[PDB]
Amino acid sequence: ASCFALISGTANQVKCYRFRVKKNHRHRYENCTTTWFTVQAQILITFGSPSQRQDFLKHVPLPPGMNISGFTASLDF
Amino acid sequence: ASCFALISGTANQVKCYRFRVKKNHRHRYENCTTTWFTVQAQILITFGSPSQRQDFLKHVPLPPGMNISGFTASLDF
């Protein structure tokens, strides 16, 4: 896809957020990554379209202390 | 203490439940154990009195698929 979201926070916040979104909002997103770091926990969520992501943003609450950035990306090579 | 609760479910349910109870209901319980198994995930929550546990039971929702058993125990030796 080309529609994404990056969620940040503690390892636990990130892990439980993903768990919630997966058990309760599976239809609101395409795929999700396991937790990763930079060599703050981070997970990448993909979306099949801006709509799905819009719907996601409207039903999934961003817990206190957590971050979320929206991205649009294109494949180069 | 002598007032307890045993919560059961998948490793993930148990882990996130504990995380929720710890960040949002810290005053409703005394201590909690990390996840353990029998050689279903299991965590043991202690309570300073039946009241606190009663209050806990009234504010903490048992997620679908999860289990909870109440116990009273006495030290023998």
From Swiss-Prot, chains A, B:
Compartments where located: Host nucleus
Post-translational modification: Oxidation of Cys-16 in response to redox signaling leads to the loss of DNA-binding activity and the inactivation of gene activator or repressor function.
Region annotation DNA-binding domain: where it falls in the sequence: 2-77
UniProt record similarity statement: Belongs to the papillomaviridae E2 protein family.
Assembly notes: Binds DNA as homodimer. Interacts with protein E1; this interaction greatly increases E1 DNA-binding activity. Interacts with protein L1; this interaction enhances E2-dependent replication and transcription activation. Interacts with protein L2; this interaction inhibits E2 transcriptional activity but not DNA replication function E2. Interacts with protein E7; this interaction inhibits E7 oncogenic activity. Interacts with host TAF1; this interaction modulates E2-dependent transcriptional regulation. Interacts with host BRD4; this interaction mediates E2 transcriptional activation function.
Role played: Plays a role in the initiation of viral DNA replication. A dimer of E2 interacts with a dimer of E1 in order to improve specificity of E1 DNA binding activity. Once the complex recognizes and binds DNA at specific sites, the E2 dimer is removed from DNA. E2 also regulates viral transcription through binding to the E2RE response element (5'-ACCNNNNNNGGT-3') present in multiple copies in the regulatory regions of the viral genome. Activates or represses transcription depending on E2RE's position with regards to proximal promoter elements including the TATA-box.
Record's protein name: Regulatory protein E2
Organism: Bovine papillomavirus type 1
Chain's gene name: E2
